[PDB]
Amino acid sequence: TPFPWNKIRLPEYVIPVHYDLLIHAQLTTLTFWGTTKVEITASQPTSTIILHSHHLQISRATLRKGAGERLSEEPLQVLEHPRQEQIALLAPEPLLVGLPYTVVIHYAGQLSETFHGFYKSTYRTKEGELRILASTQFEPTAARMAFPCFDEPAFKASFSIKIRREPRHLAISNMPLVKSVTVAEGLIEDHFDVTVKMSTYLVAFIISDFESVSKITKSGVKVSVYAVPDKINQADYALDAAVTLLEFYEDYFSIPYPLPKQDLAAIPDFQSGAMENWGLTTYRESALLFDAEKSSASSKLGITMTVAHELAHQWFGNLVTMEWWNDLWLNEGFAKFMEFVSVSVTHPELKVGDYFFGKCFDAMEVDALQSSHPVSTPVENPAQIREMFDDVSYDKGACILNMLREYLSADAFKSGIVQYLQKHSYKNTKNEDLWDSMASIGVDVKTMMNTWTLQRGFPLITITVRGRNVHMKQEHYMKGGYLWHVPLTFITSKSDMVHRFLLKTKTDVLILPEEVEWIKFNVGMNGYYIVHYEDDGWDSLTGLLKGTHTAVSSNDRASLINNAFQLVSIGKLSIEKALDLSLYLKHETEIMPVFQGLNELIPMYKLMEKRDMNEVETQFKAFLIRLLRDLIDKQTWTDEGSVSERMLRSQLLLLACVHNYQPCVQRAEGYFRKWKESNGQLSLPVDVTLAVFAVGAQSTEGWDFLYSKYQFSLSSTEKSQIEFALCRTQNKEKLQWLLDESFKGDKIKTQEFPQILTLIGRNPVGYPLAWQFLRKNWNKLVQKFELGSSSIAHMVMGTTNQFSTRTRLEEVKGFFSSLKENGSQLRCVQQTIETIEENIGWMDKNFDKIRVWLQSE
Ligand SMILES: O=C(Cn1c(=O)sc2ccc(-c3ccccc3)cc21)NC1(C(=O)O)CCCCC1
Ligand SMILES: [Zn+2]
């Protein structure tokens, strides 16, 4: 019998209203069984129900109608279409239109050995015992691997979840536990309250031995953090941050959080950073747990931002959800942007607003290529949907919202998002709904925002000044006809007020009130565009940075560094003039422009490390250390100062040590020796630990000692610092061991494999091993992480995007083309191919220019 449905999307005429999910997981055999009951109505007569199911063995399906004495069951025949991830349920007679029915399905499955679906997670107690837990990760399309369902985000429904478990385990889910009942064969059945109407991807449940801590918000919501017993003492920071951030969002959106509780659970094995399941947010342990003695300043910032992101989704994603994955940015761009809006208020000590523009420069790297996609773009299959969780949806999405908020004003933007969330509560939206809500305040936003969401890329704005006359032009910036409504901003030598000008056309002109010495567009880098200055413009701005760099803000200095190097790539500014501009950094003190200088200069030597360019590579590295020497020498070997001062210290000391700057190497060697001689008991300053460990791991004894401490560590920061240091070894047997062991997952968890593979891909001697490992183990890596996942994208780019020869380019094209349906069409593959093509052209054009410039410098 042929399958009676030939589309990837489900039929629109059978709608669920409520699910009752009964799940029994047997953690000793890894088998699980379920009974799903789904209440549906049909709007057109049909005897066939199509729904999603993947890797579930269906034992029986029945169709119920009526209740009590009028209950009429009818058996259903089951057909499956595994490629479409669907099942078809066939009734002996047609369903009556508009009447309620309940589909009852009994099935079994095996706990996934991946990081998605209903999957197995493990950890070892400090006492040595292996413990097994079971957790969920469904977004985007994995709910169908745990229970059969209408697994598309616009088929919202309420869910009543029941879990049968052993008495030794605890179960938690989206809603509060309302009753626990003893059932047959020594099991306990937990009943959770019914959820509000929501998408299937937000269902969650965890069977574990977790401990918890709790705190109640001003609104009466019970917030808890869950973690393994050995790590619950690390939960207080995230618990306090979650309460503050949930209270912030309730007041900000004027819409209370609707559930009685909110849980934040640290899972021992987790693929992404975190997930926003309504009432049960989940995290990597490194994204939630803070050790006041060993955690880094960057990890404190990261936990705060991750918690802010997941809590923003309770409104942007959960309460209001995109209608389909083509508009995933409505969830992700908003949640990413709301991290900065909220944390700027709740944790002013972190000064997170200063870092926001960095996300925009990240998006511009990918968005300058032809392989970029518009923010809103069509997707159909699960691999294509997973590809939407990328820097375009998250970072470009947040950046265009920041640009829109600055254009409309914060208050008008806030009014628009409140109307949007209120109007579409418990429903789904598309792009046009957001523009309609923003326009309902009091400005047409649709034409402008369609230019930023329906076209890939961004514009280059060119400025030409002749006395008081300021000529403006826009063109698509591309490496290798578009038109936007660009909300320009500028300051000048005579006015530090932020001036605004909306450029809606190819060119325009404005007349300054009086002549100026300089003009600087894109103030604070709040706009998603880059700027070129004709004539003496770049000389004026170079002179400004060299003589009075505090004339513009730290973020404005970072924007000039980024844009100067971006203009070299398209032939608008020579590499010599951009390097001449970078010389001002000898007097720079602030983290954002120093880090932006590193973001532009470091990749140049990473390309050289993989070429026969030893002499120029050494000279370029010596130039970089000489450039930042005074700032490096000023660093104290302590944990003193602001979060920015701590992050700047850590990276400068690590950079100096990696490049053999003897004063820093000698000090790191001394700390490592005393730390090792004290059997690793001694508390080192966290901010110098990366440099200390990276130096210490350069000997066989130091590498072995560092690895010996890894198994006992309960600190996510310390484990990450050890992994980084071990990956800097130049012993290829140890590099291959790190790849083999993290791939296996026993001594180093597989959740660390993508980072370890990229770090070894960036090791000056070990980089060929990482690309070789990815090719050899491709099938197993795809099975573990999934085609289209951000993890696979990061592995592809991490192992190949610093190649710069035609031979390496053909290796990449030839390998990925050979995969056919198992990877040849990945967007990350086209992105890395275009990046290598740019690297080839850039090195061919600029290598000798840099060699000559270094000799003159
Ligand atoms: O090069 C890299 C990694 N990396 C790339 O591969 S491309 C890239 C662009 C920017 C940065 C970066 C921005 C800010 C602060 C600090 C770094 C880093 C980076 N790491 C080191 C190295 O392998 O030589 C080793 C550690 C110290 C830094 C240098
Ligand atoms: Zn998100």
DSSP class per residue in 314-329:
TTBTTTEEESSGGGTH
| Residue carrying the six token digits 């968005």 | 367
Q: Is 52 helix (H, G, I), strand (E, B) or coil?
A: strand
Judge whether 266 and 289 are in contact, CB under 8 Å: yes
29-32-38 Cα angle (round to 5): 180
State in Å, rounded, how far the first CA of the chain is from the last one.
77
State the Cα–Cα distance between residues 658 and 729, nearest whole angstrom: 11
CB atoms within 10 A of CB 483: 15
State the Cα–Cα distance between residues 209 and 169, nearest whole angstrom: 5
State the Cα–Cα distance between residues 334 and 379, nearest whole angstrom: 20
Q: Is 679 helix (H, G, I), strand (E, B) or coil?
A: coil
Name the residue at shortest CA distance from atom 14 of ligand 1. Answer: 595
State the Cα–Cα distance between residues 723 and 741, nearest whole angstrom: 12
Q: Give every CB contact of residue 489 below 8 A, 6+ residues apart in sequence.
A: 406, 498, 499, 500, 501, 521, 522, 523, 524, 526, 527
Method: X-ray
Residues with CB under 6 Å of ligand 1 are 595, 598-599, 602-603, 606, 651, 654-655, 658, 762
Tell me which ligand sits closest to the C-alpha of residue 628.
1
Judge whether 498 and 480 are in contact, CB under 8 Å: no
Instruction: Report residue 90: phi and psi, to 5°.
Output: -105, 120
Tell me which ligand sits closest to the C-alpha of residue 312.
2
CA distances from 94 to 7, 19, 42, 65, 208 (A): 21, 22, 10, 12, 44
State the Cα–Cα distance between residues 465 and 512, nearest whole angstrom: 10
Tell me the β-bridge partners of 21. 36, 161
826-831-835 Cα angle (round to 5): 150
Pick the catalytic residue from 310, 617, 645, 723: 310
Q: Is 309 helix (H, G, I), strand (E, B) or coil?
A: helix
Judge whether 469 and 460 are in contact, CB under 8 Å: no
DSSP class per residue in 367-383:
HTSTT---SS----SHH
Helix (H) or strand (E) holding 791: helix 790-800
How far is ligand 2, taken at its centre, from the CA of residue 140, in Å? 11
Cis, bond preceding 140 (omega within 30 deg of 0) = yes
Resolution stated for this PDB structure, in Å: 1.4
Exposure of 65 in the CB half-sphere (CA atoms within 13 A): 14
Judge whether 25 and 134 are in contact, CB under 8 Å: yes
CA distances from 475 to 524, 531, 541 (A): 21, 11, 22
| Residue carrying the six token digits 């360019």 | 613
How far is ligand 1, taken at its centre, from the CA of residue 595, in Å? 10
- Report the candidate in 48, 149, 148 with the shortest Cα–Cα distance to residue 95: 48
Tell me which ligand sits closest to the C-alpha of residue 658.
1
DSSP class per residue in 574-607:
-HHHHHHHHGGGGG---HHHHHHHHHHHHHHHHH
DSSP class per residue in 542-573:
HHHHHHHGGGS-HHHHHHHHHHHHHHHHTTSS
Tell me the β-bridge partners of 65. 72
CA distances from 589 to 557, 585, 661, 691 (A): 11, 8, 20, 20
How far is ligand 2, taken at its centre, from the CA of residue 276, in Å? 7
Q: Give the helix ranges, DSSP H, for 202-328.
A: 236-253, 297-312
Residues marked as binding for substrate? 139, 273-277
Q: Which amino acid is at 394?
A: Y
Q: Give every CB contact of residue 163 below 8 A, 6+ residues apart in sequence.
A: 22, 23, 24, 25, 171, 173, 189, 190, 192, 205, 207
Strand positions, DSSP E, 369-456: 427-429
310 is catalytic: yes
Q: Cα 562 to chain center, whole Å?
A: 22
Judge whether 724 and 690 are in contact, CB under 8 Å: yes
State the Cα–Cα distance between residues 234 and 244, nearest whole angstrom: 18
Q: Are strands 459-466 and 530-533 parallel, antiparallel or unpaired?
A: parallel
How far is ligand 1, taken at its centre, from the CA of residue 660, in Å? 15
- Report the candidate in 401, 549, 407, 411 with the shortest Cα–Cα distance to residue 489: 407
Name the residue at shortest CA distance from atom 26 of ligand 1. Answer: 655
State the Cα–Cα distance between residues 592 and 590, nearest whole angstrom: 6
Residues marked as binding for Zn(2+)? 309, 313, 332
Task: Please state the atom number of ligand 1 nearest to the C-alpha of residue 598.
Answer: 13
Q: Give every CB contact of residue 401 below 8 A, 6+ residues apart in sequence.
A: 333, 334, 337
Tell me the β-bridge partners of 136. 118
Token representation of residue 84: 């479409």
- Report the candidate in 829, 711, 742 with the shortest Cα–Cα distance to residue 127: 711
Tell me the β-bridge partners of 122. 132
Cβ neighbourhood burial of 824 (10 Å; 0-12, 13-18, 19+): middle
- Report the candidate in 141, 153, 154, 196 with the shortest Cα–Cα distance to residue 174: 196
Q: Go through the chain and tell me how many residues it has.
A: 857
